Scaffold this active site. Structure first.
Site, PDB file in Angstrom:
ATOM      1  N   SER A  26       0.849  -1.132  -0.298  1.00 29.78           N
ATOM      2  CA  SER A  26      -0.109   0.121   0.068  1.00 29.78           C
ATOM      3  C   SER A  26       0.832   1.218   0.019  1.00 29.78           C
ATOM      4  O   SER A  26       1.947   1.319   0.756  1.00 29.78           O
ATOM      5  CB  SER A  26      -0.912  -0.022   1.192  1.00 29.78           C
ATOM      6  OG  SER A  26      -1.813  -1.072   1.131  1.00 29.78           O
ATOM      7  N   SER A 104       2.214  -7.288   1.343  1.00 32.32           N
ATOM      8  CA  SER A 104       1.131  -6.502   2.122  1.00 32.32           C
ATOM      9  C   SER A 104      -0.186  -6.534   1.116  1.00 32.32           C
ATOM     10  O   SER A 104      -0.383  -7.900   0.877  1.00 32.32           O
ATOM     11  CB  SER A 104       1.759  -5.151   2.299  1.00 32.32           C
ATOM     12  OG  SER A 104       0.902  -4.450   3.249  1.00 32.32           O
ATOM     13  N   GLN A 105      -0.667  -5.441   0.735  1.00 31.11           N
ATOM     14  CA  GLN A 105      -2.130  -5.472  -0.182  1.00 31.11           C
ATOM     15  C   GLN A 105      -1.669  -6.221  -1.481  1.00 31.11           C
ATOM     16  O   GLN A 105      -2.499  -6.926  -1.608  1.00 31.11           O
ATOM     17  CB  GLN A 105      -2.534  -4.025  -0.478  1.00 31.11           C
ATOM     18  CG  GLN A 105      -3.739  -4.256  -1.391  1.00 31.11           C
ATOM     19  CD  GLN A 105      -4.327  -2.823  -1.524  1.00 31.11           C
ATOM     20  OE1 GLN A 105      -5.133  -2.976  -2.703  1.00 31.11           O
ATOM     21  NE2 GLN A 105      -3.962  -1.682  -0.857  1.00 31.11           N
ATOM     22  N   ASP A 159       4.092  -8.899  13.084  1.00 29.22           N
ATOM     23  CA  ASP A 159       3.654  -8.543  12.084  1.00 29.22           C
ATOM     24  C   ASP A 159       1.928  -8.846  12.185  1.00 29.22           C
ATOM     25  O   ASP A 159       1.662  -9.688  11.748  1.00 29.22           O
ATOM     26  CB  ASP A 159       4.033  -8.565  10.744  1.00 29.22           C
ATOM     27  CG  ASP A 159       3.412  -8.085   9.437  1.00 29.22           C
ATOM     28  OD1 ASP A 159       2.581  -7.212   9.694  1.00 29.22           O
ATOM     29  OD2 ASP A 159       3.889  -8.174   8.298  1.00 29.22           O
ATOM     30  N   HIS A 172       5.982  -5.077   9.893  1.00 32.34           N
ATOM     31  CA  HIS A 172       5.582  -4.996   8.748  1.00 32.34           C
ATOM     32  C   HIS A 172       6.405  -4.540   7.741  1.00 32.34           C
ATOM     33  O   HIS A 172       6.313  -4.812   6.560  1.00 32.34           O
ATOM     34  CB  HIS A 172       4.196  -4.378   8.582  1.00 32.34           C
ATOM     35  CG  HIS A 172       3.306  -4.675   7.422  1.00 32.34           C
ATOM     36  ND1 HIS A 172       3.022  -5.802   6.876  1.00 32.34           N
ATOM     37  CD2 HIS A 172       2.757  -3.835   6.566  1.00 32.34           C
ATOM     38  CE1 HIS A 172       2.368  -5.670   5.691  1.00 32.34           C
ATOM     39  NE2 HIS A 172       2.138  -4.571   5.585  1.00 32.34           N
TER      40      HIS A 172
END
EC number: 3.1.1.74
Length: 197
Positions: A26, A104-105, A159, A172
């Site tokens: 993101s 992540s995303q 995370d 993260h």
């Protein structure tokens, strides 16, 4: 560096042997973000610059933070964009071995895309690496419809997105070492397992 469009820009008459399609996290820049460039340089060292095409997921994938909260952990438009890139790879270079990754995303996006993919194309992805996988708990460390031996998940202790939350904590943002060593190592090993060397 952060934008690579080797598949889109590449000549069909001189296909690379390996095509890597990667989705960033993101709010990250270009279409490779902070981790993709490190993976790309080590893949190029292994297969040569003409041997591997590096392709980030750009276009409609805006990597908007809020879309982490949508049902699949990203938007429908972003999944359609990554599906179109795999279909372009399959048409442009039918004999190339594919490999994939996301952070992540982008890890949620890669998992959603691979789940929806036509199996004849999915089965060409020799290895996928996922960092800070936002659906790690919900999918029990797997990508639906894709074998565990071709999957490698990097989820740091602490995370929180790996443990069912959407809170961004410092672990993260700590996947740099993994993207430099074990994640390219895994991808190279999985490509050589099917291609020989």
């Amino acid at each position: 560096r952060t934008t690579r469009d080797d598949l889109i820009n590449g000549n069909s008459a001189s296909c690379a042997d390996v095509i890597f399609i990667y989705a960033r996290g993101s709010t990250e820049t270009g279409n490779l973000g902070t981790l993709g460039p490190s993976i790309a340089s080590n893949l190029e060292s292994a297969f040569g610059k003409d041997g591997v095409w590096i392709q980030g997921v750009g276009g409609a994938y805006r990597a908007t933070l809020g879309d982490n909260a949508l049902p699949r952990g990203t938007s429908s438009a972003a999944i359609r964009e990554m599906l179109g890139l795999f279909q372009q790879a399959n048409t442009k270079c039918p004999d190339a071995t594919l490999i994939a990754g996301g952070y992540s995303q982008g890890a949620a996006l890669a998992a959603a895309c691979i789940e929806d993919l036509d199996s004849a194309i999915r089965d060409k992805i020799a290895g996928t690496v996922l960092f800070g996988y936002t659906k790690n708990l919900q999918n029990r460390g797997r990508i639906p419809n894709y074998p565990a031996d071709r999957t490698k998940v990097f989820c740091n202790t602490g995370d929180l997105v790996c443990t069912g939350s959407l809170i961004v904590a410092a672990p993260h943002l700590a996947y740099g070492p993994d993207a430099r060593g074990p994640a390219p190592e895994f991808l190279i090993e999985k490509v050589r397992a099917v291609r020989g060397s």
